[PDB]
Design a protein around this ligand. Structure first.
Ligand SMILES: Cc1ncc(COP(=O)(O)O)c(CNc2csc(C(=O)O)c2)c1O
Ligand SMILES: Cc1ncc(COP(=O)(O)O)c(CNc2csc(C(=O)O)c2)c1O
Lengths: 396, 396
């Protein structure tokens, strides 16, 4: 049965990772990492999370299965984060949330739900996007089409090209939007651009699918949800796949949410019954530990305040690195405009380097980024900035 | 998009659960539960698990993502449990294990892997089985066909009927076997019957899929793997979906494994690359907490000994309840042979009651089982046995 199976395309993440590992050189630098790192180059467990985990160890009396949609408090806190306390969406009971194994799990549950229960055949994704989007939707039998996004000349959102591309989208197609901190570009629509897109989506009959993996990493929790909320104000229906992997530092505990919104409570409950069926046939019910940590923190004033500050600290360190990168490149004699880096949001940006410059950086200088030239600004520290920038200047 | 969606068939588990909840009566009894309960009617966190969780709280320094296939130690310990220390399968590097979100996750990963990478179109499942098997395989686009299993007259394995049914299975079909503690019947093949099935499967070209959710609950860890090991001795290829939900009491942490076996290391590695692709497009990588608890326990002599005894205690309490049930039914004047209950393995048995007797038990006596008459023997206690049995006698 297995003798003729073709190997999966080689894992570029493992990577990357393996080549970085094997590199004998000082002072090698990894900007290809997917996770947040602090100023010491570590990805520690958040203090709020450790406190929550201690509480759970002390207080949990069973590991009995959660419901298919997971911890109710988790769902409520999630909806509040997404839509705002006192949202009409929430008051009108138009939203249902399933706790899922990560944002990826939320995307797959959405995909399976759509493939099995609706006429959706096609999902529109930005060019570029997170490479796993295509894999996830294709796995559910959905076609993926790309829309223009990145102005490679100006390092900005090519809004005209985006709108032009999306004209080929038919009524009943899904359009995927990154809520904030677009991956890989860090380029997000302005609020006005979100409002234009929201209006257009209603007119064209698109089903919006928001992917929210970085809430809090651009400007702040509420500010980062403005785009979603602009859509939510205009649409009867949408889906949000969110993740707590980066903003709680809970990567390996697999904590995310799939939130379904419909015109009213009867309709969302009916649709959600099929989303739960989709979950039941996949992993049955979701993993408690990470989601319980999130619910414990979000629902406690003390823990929530500690967590919010920890998230603020991450957001701010990333901003400081964006600034330090631009200043240091100028001071190492780059003699080119990198100001776009200051304006971009979240851990990721395109450096504007070509695939060959990126390969050169890896081979000659032991500086590691992904082929598109995307770099994780959180892999940067005050200590590694000067060598990093000297290497980049050298390949310009 | 959502206005015309048909509701999923009503959840019979929630159930059941809700009706039991709402019942005003003493002394209501729930034999429809899916989990183990102790003599006090609780499903506590195992002491070995609490000790492991304390260790992890103390020692974990990151929540950085696991690899797609999860914790390496977990995979190694899993393979040892399944195949035995010093298994040729292990020595020859013929097996690869992905840590998954529960046994259900392992079954879905197997299903997706098979649907996408092989000519498999059909999975053979016992009549009866766990109702979610059909849902999981159908979700991946695989047809499910049933084979005869339960001799409703004799409360035994209808081996002749089983073999006859499975003659309709074509070469290249998957045949699902419950490793031990068949759900719902508690009726398992004898070792000789397993050996006959292993020979037949080779001859007919079936791909065996073992579902192992109850290792340790029949006779013991090694004894319960005899069937699997008989197949493993005969086959180049097989898949095992295992779960640690019941034997570690880790239900809600979603801890299982999908183990792929092929003729040699080159072939299994190549095939496993596509199993990892299947995982990546589903939930990306698996939840650490539960699997880390399992790996911590299994790989430490002290914790493993505590856990093994806890599992033994569960196994033995279930056996004592099977015995007490049969004795108490006789002493309440049932006047019918229930000896089959003593011989059956694990938490579940068919009582031999009809769907209407089961409904009567619920409505008139507040005793709750599933419609097929399956009962969870672990819902039985010395304290509730007499009323339970008086109710059953009353509906005979
Ligand atoms: C756009 C987008 N969508 C979904 C996800 C899924 O988050 P989790 O599955 O980790 O919760 C993520 C985060 N997962 C991720 C891990 S490394 C990475 C990267 O681009 O380097 C991304 C994301 O960036
Ligand atoms: C035959 C079989 N296959 C797979 C599973 C999956 O185990 P987890 O997904 O819970 O790890 C299980 C256990 N899941 C389960 C929860 S309640 C239940 C029942 O029949 O009542 C079964 C099983 O009995």
């Amino acid at each position: 049965m297995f003798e003729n199976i073709t190997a999966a395309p080689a894992d570029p993440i493992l990577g990357l990772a393996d080549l970085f590992r094997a590199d004998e050189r000082p002072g090698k630098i990894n900007l290809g990492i997917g996770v947040y790192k602090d100023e010491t180059g570590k990805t520690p467990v958040l203090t709020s999370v450790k406190k929550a985990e201690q509480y759970l160890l002390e207080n949990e009396t069973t590991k009995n299965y959660l419901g298919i949609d997971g911890i109710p408090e988790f769902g409520r806190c999630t909806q509040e984060l997404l839509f705002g306390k006192g949202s009409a969406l929430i008051n009108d009971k138009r939203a249902r949330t399933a706790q899922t194994p990560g944002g990826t799990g939320a995307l797959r549950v959405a995909a399976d739900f759509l493939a099995k229960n609706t006429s959706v055949k096609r999902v529109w994704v930005s060019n570029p996007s997170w490479p796993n989007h295509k894999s996830v939707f294709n796995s559910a039998g959905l076609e993926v089409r790309e829309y223009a996004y990145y102005d490679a000349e100006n390092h900005t959102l090519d809004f005209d090209a985006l709108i032009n591309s999306l004209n080929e989208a038919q009524a009943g197609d899904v359009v995927l939007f990154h809520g904030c901190c677009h991956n890989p570009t860090g380029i997000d629509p302005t609020l006005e651009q979100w409002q234009t897109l929201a209006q257009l989506s209603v007119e064209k009959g698109w089903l919006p699918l928001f992917d929210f993996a970085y809430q809090g990493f651009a400007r702040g929790l509420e500010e980062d949800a403005e785009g979603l909320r602009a859509f939510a104000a205009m649409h009867k229906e949408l889906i949000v796949a969110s993740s707590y992997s980066k903003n709680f530092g809970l990567y390996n505990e697999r904590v995310g949410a799939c939130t379904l919104v419909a015109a009213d409570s009867e309709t969302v409950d009916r649709a959600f019954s099929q989303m739960k069926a989709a979950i039941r046939a996949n992993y049955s019910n979701p993993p408690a530990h990470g989601a319980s940590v999130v619910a414990t923190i979000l629902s406690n004033d003390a823990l929530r305040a500690i967590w919010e500050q920890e998230l603020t600290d991450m957001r701010q360190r990333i901003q400081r690195m964006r600034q330090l990168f631009v200043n240091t490149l100028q001071e190492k004699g780059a003699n080119r405009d990198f100001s776009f880096i200051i304006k971009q949001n979240g851990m990721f940006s395109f450096s504007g380097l070509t695939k060959e410059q990126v390969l050169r950086l890896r081979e000659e200088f032991g500086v590691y980024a992904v082929a598109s030239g995307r770099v994780n600004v959180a892999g940067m520290t005050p200590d590694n900035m000067a060598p990093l920038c000297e290497a980049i200047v050298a390949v310009l």
